[PDB]
Amino acid sequence: GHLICNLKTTYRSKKPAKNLKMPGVYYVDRRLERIKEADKETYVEQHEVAVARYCDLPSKLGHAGGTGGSMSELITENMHMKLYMEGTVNNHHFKCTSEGEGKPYEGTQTMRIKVVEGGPLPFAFDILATSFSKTFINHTQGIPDFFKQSFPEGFTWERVTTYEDGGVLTATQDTSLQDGCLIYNVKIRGVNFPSNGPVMQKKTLGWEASTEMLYPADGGLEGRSDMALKLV
Amino acid sequence: GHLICNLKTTYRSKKPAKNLKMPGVYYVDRRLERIKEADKETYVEQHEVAVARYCDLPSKLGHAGGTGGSMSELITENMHMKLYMEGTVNNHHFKCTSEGEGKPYEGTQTMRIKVVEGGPLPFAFDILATSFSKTFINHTQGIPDFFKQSFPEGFTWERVTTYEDGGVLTATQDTSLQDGCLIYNVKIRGVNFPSNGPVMQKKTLGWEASTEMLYPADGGLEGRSDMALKLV
Amino acid sequence: GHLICNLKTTYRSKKPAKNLKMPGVYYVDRRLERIKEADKETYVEQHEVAVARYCDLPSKLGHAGGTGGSMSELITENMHMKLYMEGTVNNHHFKCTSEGEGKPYEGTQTMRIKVVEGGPLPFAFDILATSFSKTFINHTQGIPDFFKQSFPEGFTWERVTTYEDGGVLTATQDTSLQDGCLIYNVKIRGVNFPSNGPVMQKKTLGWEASTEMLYPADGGLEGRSDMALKLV
Amino acid sequence: GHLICNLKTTYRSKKPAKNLKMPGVYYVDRRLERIKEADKETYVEQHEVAVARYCDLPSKLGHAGGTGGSMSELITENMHMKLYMEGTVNNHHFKCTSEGEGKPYEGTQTMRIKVVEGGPLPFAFDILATSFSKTFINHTQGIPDFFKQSFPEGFTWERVTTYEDGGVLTATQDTSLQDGCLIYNVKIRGVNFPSNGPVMQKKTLGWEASTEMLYPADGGLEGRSDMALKLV
């Protein structure tokens, strides 16, 4: 079976608004997969593929179009990332680091992750999966790319993930570009994960594929998604 | 801008489970549009197109795959529907009726709707849109069709829609097939819609396209979606 | 153990706003218990004691200076109630009728309840308990009584109760005064109660005491409370 | 008017459970007040009074009894506190320190608070108020005191506060006793506070009084409350 959660996210550019070409309401389809783990999840490799689309269904009210996408020459066909993460789930403190690479225009990426403090964690690593990369979304289908456009200044995101069994996980993130490398700094605070639930019992088996709806809200973007966590 | 809401739905077949071929986790993309309205929304025409898909992104872990879709000869390529709806929003009681037709395998359908008691309504008709038809989803991409398979016995759905400004709308529905016509009986109970919000002030302009995730669960299938209501 | 739910309620007065005397933010302490049950919960007896208080704690800021309590000549020291209930929980349809007597100023009332239709219920009767009487709250500590003041016109209430395991029950209610008897007409719509949860498994044993915070909002009052359902 | 929020808290003792006398379900009534502020809320003085009670309404079960309260001589009639706080709201990072004193058995306390980093804050200080002391609750009315009993080992708490306009604030806290002084270490992570809302616009004026319901949940206590934030 599955345990469901809901994500509510706000994405904020550090680039002045007058310099951003904004998208309309759009959708990002994703498949985030665990590729490898070692030593009770103190080492994890994750891969994600993410493709943006405007709704392609026919419209009876007429197609409202745009002026195609955006350009961001600071973001190359191949990019590397480095990440630092710190936080708490329930009463348990931890730190992680990761490094990876991907193809920002093709929407694919890999992260190799180490738990460097607080390991092994008392909770399923799956609940951290979405906190490890918005620059790697394929927006080539004519959608202005809020994320790639944000450079050199970069952007932040902030999110609340609400699990249907009481766990709540907030996360805040800073994304910068430094000497050609993307740098992520992430902070996590999760609370009220049930002691008898699959997260604290480590009885999860990764995420199903997902769709996120993104929409303009106050100069930035907000996102909404429901995700399904596979259970043992 | 937009007002967001979240849908949590349980779909229950009246057909014995041993006679149902169940789908895996899948997604339905929709575009529900208002085609016409008259006399302050006491007459409304709605159209929907709905297309089911499994995740089509490549997988690194390779997938189980499926054994194809299902067959349901009772559901013809053209079908008619009749609907009766009764309920309350806040303190306001009302009844609606509708009739329509569509193409269940192509995923398209039209409803022509009349408010027959309690009109004109003091709230935006848009909050009733999703309560007016699961037999009309295109599952031809090889996804077993829980809804079409449920006939002749039929199925029910029950849903809570939670608006981000406090409105909550529950609905329960019975779907039957009588003399070749689909018959819908729907009951609505909405509460706490804010007096100063766009619903009670009638400042809404229809729904954005949406994606619903459906998965085998408590009962038959459960569904999750977030929808974005356009604002004046 | 306990199962926890949250109540959000809006109370609307039929009587014009100008006529009504409005209370400051205040809290109602309630103990609701089931005196008797029979025939698989087909017949239930419920007793409620409700007392209303302004905060009794000392204030350094020193805010108080209430103009005093309201007068409701229409409401006698002893009052009688007749109730009609129609509801659906999940896919189940039921009808309930009740007759009761109480001392409104005292804040004590007794209800004798019969399940006319759909008995025996497949779900715990406990979820229904809140739905079955705001006129019977002791406001004699100088708090203007929004409910007693509403007569002869009467009032409505509307509520969503959200259970921490997914059940959601909305209810709307009309309160009138006819030939000296209080008349309640209530409508219930519950959805998504888990098949493996204590409500559907009938493993509950009544409610703990509660406190509701009430505050002026838009037109009338809104209320917020959390309640704890005892488990077997 | 008011902006409402909901608090869900888990309280965990660091003392072995076989050394704790647990309370039954109970209620804590509080009045938290701002006494002084200076320099755009970069200095704040807060006072709280908190009194625990079992329900004191009569029962028809007439079946309620307890062994009375508990004893904790490490907690003296007067106690001092020192606090360190760090966190983020939306995209804004900050740190605070405080020191104060109180009467743990009378349920009163005062904290003098400084914003030491990230001041002045772009959000209402009110949203941090509940993160600055459970040892100072008057449980003298025969209720076992989970918090006072936890010493010398101490306890933690973790909380999610959900505002009805989208703001979500999680907090985690460690409480220890060091050389006779209570030491608090608090971490805050708030997200999605609306730019047009009273928190980000600094249009708030403190909290109404509140009641928290506490109940045993898996070796420790859980708490539930709704709080009302006064608006300008």
Residue numbers in the entry:
A (entry chain B), B (entry chain A), C (entry chain C), D (entry chain F): 1 to 132, 136 to 235
The publication says:
Here we report the systematic evaluation of circular permutation sites in mCherry and mKate, and the development of highly efficient circularly permutated red fluorescent proteins (cp-RFPs). We performed a similar circular permutation analysis of the monomeric far-red protein mKate, which derives from the sea anemone Entacmaea quadricolor and shares structural similarities with mCherry. Structural analysis revealed three highly homologous loop regions in mCherry and mKate, and these areas along with flanking sites were systematically explored.
A. Cartoon presentation of mKate (pH 7.0), cp-mKate154-153 and cp-mKate168-167. Each region tolerated circular permutation, but fluorescence varied markedly, with most efficient permutation sites tending to occur within the central loop regions. We found that circular permutation of mKate enhanced green fluorescence in several constructs, augmenting absorption at 442 nm. Future studies will be directed at determining the structural basis for fluorescence variation in circular permutants of mKate.
